[PDB]
Design a protein around this ligand. Sequence first.
Ligand SMILES: *[C@@H]1O[C@H](CO)[C@@H](O[C@@H]2O[C@H](CO)[C@@H](O[C@@H]3O[C@H](CO[C@H]4O[C@H](CO)[C@@H](O)[C@H](O)[C@@H]4O)[C@@H](O)[C@H](O[C@H]4O[C@H](CO)[C@@H](O)[C@H](O)[C@@H]4O)[C@@H]3O)[C@H](O)[C@H]2NC(C)=O)[C@H](O)[C@H]1NC(C)=O
Ligand SMILES: N=C(N)c1ccc(C(=O)NCCC(=O)N[C@@H](CC(=O)O)C(=O)N[C@@H](Cc2ccccc2)C(=O)O)cc1
Ligand SMILES: *[C@@H]1O[C@H](CO)[C@@H](O[C@@H]2O[C@H](CO)[C@@H](O)[C@H](O)[C@H]2NC(C)=O)[C@H](O)[C@H]1NC(C)=O
Ligand SMILES: *[C@@H]1O[C@H](CO)[C@@H](O)[C@H](O)[C@H]1NC(C)=O
Ligand SMILES: [Ca+2]
Ligand SMILES: [Ca+2]
Ligand SMILES: [Ca+2]
Ligand SMILES: [Ca+2]
Ligand SMILES: [Ca+2]
Ligand SMILES: [Mg+2]
Lengths: 466, 454
Amino acid sequence: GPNICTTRGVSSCQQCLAVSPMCAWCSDEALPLGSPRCDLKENLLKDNCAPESIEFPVSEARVLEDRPLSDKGSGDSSQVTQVSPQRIALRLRPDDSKNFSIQVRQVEDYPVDIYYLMDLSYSMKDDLWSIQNLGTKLATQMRKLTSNLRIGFGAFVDKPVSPYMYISPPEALENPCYDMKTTCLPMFGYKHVLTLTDQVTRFNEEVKKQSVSRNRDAPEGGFDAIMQATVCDEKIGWRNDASHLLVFTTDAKTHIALDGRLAGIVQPNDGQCHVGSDNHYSASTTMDYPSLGLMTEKLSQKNINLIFAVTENVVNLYQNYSELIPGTTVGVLSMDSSNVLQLIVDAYGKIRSKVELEVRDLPEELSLSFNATCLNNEVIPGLKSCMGLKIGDTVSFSIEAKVRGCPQEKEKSFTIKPVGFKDSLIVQVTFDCDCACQAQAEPNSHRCNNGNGTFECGVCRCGPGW
Amino acid sequence: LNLDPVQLTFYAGPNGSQFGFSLDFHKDSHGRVAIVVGAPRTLGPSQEETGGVFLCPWRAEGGQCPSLLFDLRDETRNVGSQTLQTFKARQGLGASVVSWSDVIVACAPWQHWNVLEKTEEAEKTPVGSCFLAQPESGRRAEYSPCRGNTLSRIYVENDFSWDKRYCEAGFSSVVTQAGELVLGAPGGYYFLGLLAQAPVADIFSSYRPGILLWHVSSQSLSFDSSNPEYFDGYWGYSVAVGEFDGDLNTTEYVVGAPTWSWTLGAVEILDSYYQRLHRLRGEQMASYFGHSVAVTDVNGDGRHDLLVGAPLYMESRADRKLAEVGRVYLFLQPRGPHALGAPSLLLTGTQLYGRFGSAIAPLGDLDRDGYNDIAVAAPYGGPSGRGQVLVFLGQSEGLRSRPSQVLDSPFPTGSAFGFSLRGAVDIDDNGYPDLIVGAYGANQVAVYRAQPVV
Ligand SMILES: *[C@@H]1O[C@H](CO)[C@@H](O[C@@H]2O[C@H](CO)[C@@H](O[C@@H]3O[C@H](CO[C@H]4O[C@H](CO)[C@@H](O)[C@H](O)[C@@H]4O)[C@@H](O)[C@H](O[C@H]4O[C@H](CO)[C@@H](O)[C@H](O)[C@@H]4O)[C@@H]3O)[C@H](O)[C@H]2NC(C)=O)[C@H](O)[C@H]1NC(C)=O
Ligand SMILES: N=C(N)c1ccc(C(=O)NCCC(=O)N[C@@H](CC(=O)O)C(=O)N[C@@H](Cc2ccccc2)C(=O)O)cc1
Ligand SMILES: *[C@@H]1O[C@H](CO)[C@@H](O[C@@H]2O[C@H](CO)[C@@H](O)[C@H](O)[C@H]2NC(C)=O)[C@H](O)[C@H]1NC(C)=O
Ligand SMILES: *[C@@H]1O[C@H](CO)[C@@H](O)[C@H](O)[C@H]1NC(C)=O
Ligand SMILES: [Ca+2]
Ligand SMILES: [Ca+2]
Ligand SMILES: [Ca+2]
Ligand SMILES: [Ca+2]
Ligand SMILES: [Ca+2]
Ligand SMILES: [Mg+2]
């Protein structure tokens, strides 16, 4: 019987397929005048349409790259696969939809970078003595989880300028603790100490030579240090294929953007590296503190997982900042940093206990829908993020793409990538709106009103200009 | 709406002086409007930055301006077996300017101060200082309410209470219609923030050159606190005045504290005795709620309304992602004795890192429809990030949710176009209030004249 393919009364093969994904087109010459040429593929063969003259694209989805998920991130030159498939070929006809799956694995024994960024203001005087063997102790604990560990160290205080800095007497510049009975370092903003290295005993020995300084106001300029430790790739030494952990420890409040105006500093933070060969932040006295949004941009850009390891008296503060900087973790630090070790191991586990998918460069006309499979084969519709995972676990997502009409460009591509992951699924889309019989059309055909038209796919169309 | 963005006027100052960091209109004894401009990094005598003030006559062509000269020499006085010291190097003179009557008040929030007694000292700290001038007569005066002669040891023994050594008085400023200078000092009381009030007349009559430490009996400073909510709150980052209690004989103070309560931010309305009347709390941490405050009646009910800017507010967007754009809050004053409720309107920026809300200038009645209007700056907004000033018109229900006019920066990138604003004054005497915009990054001021409505 009649259906939407015929009742619509189309004019060409292109308009026929645009009606519904089920319609088809017969481009045969020997076809009755009353019989329509835009009907179901079952009705066309029923009316003796030549099979080769049948245009009926089918929405499909075939894989192109389907490497197996690696069992061990160890070894290799980062030839580790943690997303499968890595690439697929999608084909959609107007207003149709096709589905496909993706698998993600929190690979076991994956390299890790841990940069220790420590407050060395006077308030942290007794904290330095509790991490003198942290490098070797931390090696012993991470050895259970990864065979490629690198650790580094940096320190900060605040912008070395009045009123943050003591500027009188002249002796106070060389020794801020001059009015007391002790010596402390001259004040410094942020200084890189140790590049990420696998020689863990370099951490211990570099720590044992560190000492605290002293400034005036309680909030410390540790956000300057978070920025530089993030955007100075080559100096800190982050590895391309490794988990990046930035451990930020302090016992006090922090300065934020627009605070610098109390020192005469108005220039916004540019988010660029300014750590020279002296390993000191040279824009400390001329550039304002960074903003939470700018910090989030560069952290997400360099795949850095920030860890606030702060004391009980400011957990609520940094727990509220952590919510304004997604992907950030918080842990409670004892008053002497004696538990910083277990704090890190717990944070690294909490970091790799989640898998959240992210879409990039999705065309306007495409809409996606997700169904998650976390834990034991439990489907969770309308969800694209798992939680409560462990190292070695594996999850999978079912995805359906729904195209609206037909776009102009017939080939586009977008990416599906988990947050913080290196590998990703690339979806190569191809919109099959046209008919193969259009590539063999007859412009100015004798069959079409004395050449006033064009003959394609077995019908006469009005030529250009009409 | 009817600001002319085609034919502008440009005043300019020395290169690298931050000319236009602060500005204000100034009428002489004859009502002739001029423009006072602050240049906090102008060079002094020893070729070292000390700041400077300029008084620009009105000329449709613009051009250069004469300096308003102040003393830039460091001072020293040996008295009372002590040694008083002022240090004007990098003091930032012109970091804030304001005009009242035929008097200009230019302030150096980072002028340093120290006291020496044998081997002890009070510590060399930024107490701040303001310079007052009557240009027509040449009279000069100073006001540094946070200078003290207490030694370092005493503050430690008293646990750093009532420590005004880091006031930075002059950070912000305002003058009541009665003639009372109100200074914001975000570093007072060990970075709690304090206010300092005093009549201009008493400042002048009680000042003599070389004294350095003198009494102004009629002054009135705010109070220290032990509440950690006020710690590092920078109470006095911005200041404004208005009428919010219904008593026309009393003047109320509006104070911004953009880091109040662990960087939550707050704005407080107070009486002239610093007794708190209301408190608006920030909506988001680190947004710097209170960076800028403005007082003007927008809905034409005679009751001043309050505007607050949070330039670093991060708007929520799709996929659980935030975007720093800035935001401005409108609070309409209720009829009679009642508390200011929730915000009547939320204006949010669009350009990332644009800092919409960094400055808010009352414009008066721009289009002359009976409702006062405002201007909001986005010093790094606009599609180019060069800067933008948006105009919002008043209405019976508050403000319009969309701008009536947008002024794009005529300067290059990094000009900070809109960092400072000032309106509600008719400089060409055409019957329409005009707007002056500062761009300290380009060392220039731009004057937009209001024309009849097209
Ligand atoms: C980190 O972020 C958290 C979460 O935002 C902050 O904790 C909030 O702090 C605010 C202000 O201190 C609290 O707001 C107050 O709520 C009280 C009632 O809360 C009830 O309901 C919550 C629901 O979870 C319970 O947890 C709670 O125990 C109560 O049962 C009101 O009484 C308060 O109103 C009073 O004070 C205000 C002025 O603040 C007046 O205007 C009112 O008229 C009234 O007098 C107020 O609304 C909020 O409850 C807190 N939430 C939580 C979950 O604790 C932290 O402060 C923040 N920390 C840092 C360091 O930034
Ligand atoms: N009501 C007031 N007028 C008032 C309000 C707040 C303060 C304040 O924050 N004081 C904290 C100053 C501070 O913490 N300085 C740091 C500088 C640094 O970290 O290097 C420090 O040394 N803190 C040490 C020593 C210390 C210094 C001054 C006061 C107390 C303790 C600590 O907390 O142990 C002071 C006064
Ligand atoms: C996600 O789950 C939903 C519901 O579990 C799926 O929708 C169902 O699909 C079947 C098979 O096509 C239909 O018969 C049902 O009517 C659908 N139910 C709905 C929509 O509520 C959906 O296909 C899944 N998506 C993906 C990408 O796997
Ligand atoms: C789409 O879902 C069906 C189950 O209804 C499944 O059999 C099929 O494999 C899915 N498509 C792809 C490309 O995996
Ligand atoms: Ca500090
Ligand atoms: Ca009053
Ligand atoms: Ca009103
Ligand atoms: Ca108006
Ligand atoms: Ca005018
Ligand atoms: Mg400290």
